[PDB]
Design a protein around this ligand. Structure first.
Ligand SMILES: Cc1cc2nc3c(=O)[nH]c(=O)nc-3n(C[C@H](O)[C@H](O)[C@H](O)COP(=O)(O)OP(=O)(O)OC[C@H]3O[C@@H](n4cnc5c(N)ncnc54)[C@@H](O)[C@@H]3O)c2cc1C
Ligand SMILES: Cc1cc2nc3c(=O)[nH]c(=O)nc-3n(C[C@H](O)[C@H](O)[C@H](O)COP(=O)(O)OP(=O)(O)OC[C@H]3O[C@@H](n4cnc5c(N)ncnc54)[C@H](O)[C@@H]3O)c2cc1C
Lengths: 478, 478
């Protein structure tokens, strides 16, 4: 029991956490960041974003060397097999450098990193419990009196009832990122972005991937047209899709080494028994309020497990702000970064805004799928009259020149104001291109305004320019 | 001779030419496009943009397979060698599809393609003479009675005086595009964008490149910092630099197949006897008015060889527009296309302007260089007080994750209004990323307006956001 005081304490060091802590230190405050696990960055830099994307880029280079190389005029005279150990080391060292860089950024901003479990004592004090391993609390058991405290605890994997996730043979997203042996068959329960990306990296490597999902279409936040097309390019890449299918059982049959799965189709209530070497339960992610002690002070949790807030990011206590994956919004690292900034700006200025309508969702498969704004379904649901204007990458100059033409840029605009309402891009660099769609939405620009922007030749950004040209008038290469 | 009448005729089928033809046709005009060579696309699709970028991308993938592959966890049990014939074929197919795509578009938009040379009879009409080995060289002469004439004759390589450009040993950009074997040495005379991209291709394939440039800075249209840093990463890639050096003489020798270059350093003048297998002569590109018959009607040409126009693109004759590389402005395909569309919509509306302050310039090397707006030196001369914002790709999440951390983003904003005056990006995807800065400059957006938009995680576009953020205030990740 050792007592210290700070202006702000951030309980959690993820995208919402470490970002809120750096911005507060830059805003004059005496900041604290309490992180439970031995590294910072949270789920995104250790179990999320950075691990999966390192795996995804390197698997695509193995895939291009196996498929595209001959056609690109490069002869690989012999075998090309993946060294799973160094494949993992390329990913681990990226995680190691980024998490080690957040600790250095804290050190430069003079944010006191408390390496222990953060819990409430009062609605003013935070008990920093020691956790096992390297640096427990800051020489055992702290209590911190704070003026403002921002709860930036994250998320955890939603478990499937009855399935024991032993991350070895029945892995979750985390188990899948560390597999030191590539499966002959990898079954995935969940058609979401996390399941689709994990399906991609291992199918490129050799796994006969199958994706079981209760919903008909995949990536369920996607535009209908984009999602149906996302099934099609992944099915050409080698992913099988068992849709409208609920999983019943899943058990390690250790005698045969095979995770004996049993599923049932929704339209026809018959059941199949499947067999996969590794099973992945990517059914979702839920909030993590455990160990924080929301029950002591009475911080409201809803039916989903999320700490509720108002538009000013605070809960029933005006000084206790909840941000990230534990609170409302799409469970995305940059959404959490925007909330970590906006919450902290509210403490120094009384102002801050996260535009929830301009939050990009990007699946980093190849082609990358990315989208901002409203989908077709949402505009027809709202009764908004809209003009569609897509442009295939097969028509784009750099896409053909780079022999990477899968996808299209789709611009949905309002028919009478002609302003961009949505932008849904299946394509190479789609996560990069949606940034252009993001900035155009923030300014409330029309399809015509970006069409009048001079885009360089040859670039993939011209597909955007001309998708917009096709929306209000006519495109040149279409 | 046969005399047919059209509303608009375009003398040229390059970027400016064919989009002007497609747009005029889309605007209802009876459009005709006269192209002397067998294909549309001009210099860009045939011997420019599309072929060099195709060689730039495939050589980069060879370069990734040869150096980065094992570190990405991909072990090749064999030998990675570049097949120059399949490499050249990949380039040719890209060019072939693209050019054929414009013919499909000309049939779709009902443009009348005349394969033959266009000339001025008088100011009111054009003559299409038959060419030579041209597949479809319009039987015998045509005399088109035209209401409006757009001159998109473009450009040609500027020959270095005293050097015999044979497309075998003393090549120009077109020569180096179709080189059947990788030379042991490649001396380039011209440190611009074209010569540097061609240096990157062959340094990546096996050639010991040496670039020679008269002035003390390479690729000069660049910012001072960008040009010092572009020279540094290219030197790092294996390209030697002979700055402040002029070529005195260069003669092909076949008693030992070597172009014996003789250079001289402009400061402390002393001769050096250089040697190479091939010699790229990429000193520049000058306007091409040959065979047009401009002089016949007295069309004003300046001392630099450009066909002079006014603000509205008209020559001294008010119905004869001149667009593209043959007239004023930077010799860029997208600049040309904008001039093509503008000259055509001026016939419909009576007004049209191209924002010359918002035209990017992309070097498609790796890392890519790309800049739009005012340079630092341009701002010191104009007496503009400006703030600098810089964010390296070493601190960017997706760049570090992809092991491609070379470069930075540099937003130049005004000190008083804080709007983005210029943006200079060295890095992976910089050519794609400069389009976001393009929207910014168009809308008069400030460094804060980009820093406030929610950029997806993990992406390279976040480095743009963080550099804008650092320009007016402070970056979160550095
Ligand atoms: C190696 C290389 C790489 C390049 N890379 C890029 C790049 O990445 N991005 C970029 O923006 N730019 C690039 N450029 C420059 C680009 O090629 C030019 O900016 C663009 O092609 C200019 O278009 P244009 O319409 O004016 O004319 P051009 O494309 O030059 O073509 C005009 C056409 O006019 C015809 N013609 C000429 N005279 C007559 C006549 N009297 N009668 C009938 N027909 C005639 C043909 O000869 C010719 O093809 C590159 C150039 C080179 C050489
Ligand atoms: C495989 C995968 C890939 C993903 N890819 C992307 C992507 O590409 N782009 C994207 O935007 N999003 C992605 N996400 C989602 C992203 O990881 C989350 O949106 C992001 O981590 C949210 O940040 P956060 O700060 O809210 O929470 P988190 O990063 O989860 O971090 C919160 C931290 O709180 C700590 N903590 C929890 N309780 C306590 C307590 N009581 N005391 C102290 N510390 C505590 C946890 O240990 C944790 O490290 C991915 C997720 C997964 C699983």
């Amino acid at each position: 029991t050792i007592n210290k005081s700070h202006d702000v304490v951030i309980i959690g060091g993820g995208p919402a956490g470490y970002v809120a802590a750096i911005k507060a230190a830059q805003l004059g405050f005496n900041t604290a960041c309490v992180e439970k696990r031995g590294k910072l960055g949270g789920t995104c830099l250790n179990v999320g974003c950075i691990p999966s994307k390192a795996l995804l880029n390197n698997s695509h280079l193995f895939h291009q060397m196996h498929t595209e190389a001959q056609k690109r005029g490069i002869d690989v005279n012999g075998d090309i097999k993946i060294n799973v150990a160094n494949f993992q080391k390329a990913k681990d060292d990226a995680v190691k450098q980024l998490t080690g860089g957040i600790e250095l950024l804290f050190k430069k901003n003079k944010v006191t990193y408390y390496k222990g479990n953060g819990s409430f004592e009062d609605e003013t004090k935070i008990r920093v419990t020691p956790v096992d391993g390297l640096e427990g609390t800051v020489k055992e058991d702290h209590i911190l009196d704070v003026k403002n405290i921002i709860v930036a605890t994250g998320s955890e994997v939603t478990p499937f009832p009855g399935i024991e996730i032993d991350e070895e043979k029945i892995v979750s997203s985390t188990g899948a990122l560390s597999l030191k042996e590539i499966p002959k068959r990898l079954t995935i329960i969940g058609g979401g972005i996390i399941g689709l990306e994990m399906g991609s990296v291992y199918s490129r490597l050799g796994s006969k991937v199958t994706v079981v999902e209760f919903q008909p279409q995949i990536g369920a936040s996607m535009d209908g047209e984009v999602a149906k097309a996302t099934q099609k390019f992944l099915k050409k890449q080698g992913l099988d899709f068992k849709l409208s299918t609920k999983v019943i059982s899943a058990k390690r049959n250790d005698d045969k080494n095979v995770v004996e799965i049993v599923v049932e189709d929704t339209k026809t209530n018959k059941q199949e028994n499947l067999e996969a070497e590794v099973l992945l339960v990517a059914v979702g992610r839920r909030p993590y309020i455990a160990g924080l002690g929301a029950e002591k002070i009475g911080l409201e949790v809803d039916k989903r497990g999320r700490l509720v807030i108002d538009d000013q990011f605070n809960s029933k206590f005006p000084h206790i702000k909840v941000v990230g994956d534990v609170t409302f919004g799409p469970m995305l690292a940059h959404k959490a970064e925007e909330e970590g900034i906006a919450a902290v700006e509210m403490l120094k200025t009384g102002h801050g805004h996260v535009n929830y309508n301009n939050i990009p969702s990007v699946m980093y498969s190849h082609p990358e799928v990315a989208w901002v704004g409203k989908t077709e379904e949402q505009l027809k649901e709202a009764g908004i009259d809209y003009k569609i204007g897509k442009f295939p990458f097969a028509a784009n100059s750099r896409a053909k020149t780079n022999q990477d033409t899968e996808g299209f840029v789709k611009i949905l605009i309002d028919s009478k104001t002609e302003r961009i309402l949505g932008a849904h891009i299946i394509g190479p660099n789609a996560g990069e291109m949606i940034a252009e769609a993001g900035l155009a939405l923030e300014y409330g620009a029309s399809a015509e305004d970006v069409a009048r922007v001079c885009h360089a030749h040859p670039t993939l950004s011209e597909a955007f320019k001309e998708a917009n040209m096709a929306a209000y008038d006519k495109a040149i290469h279409c």
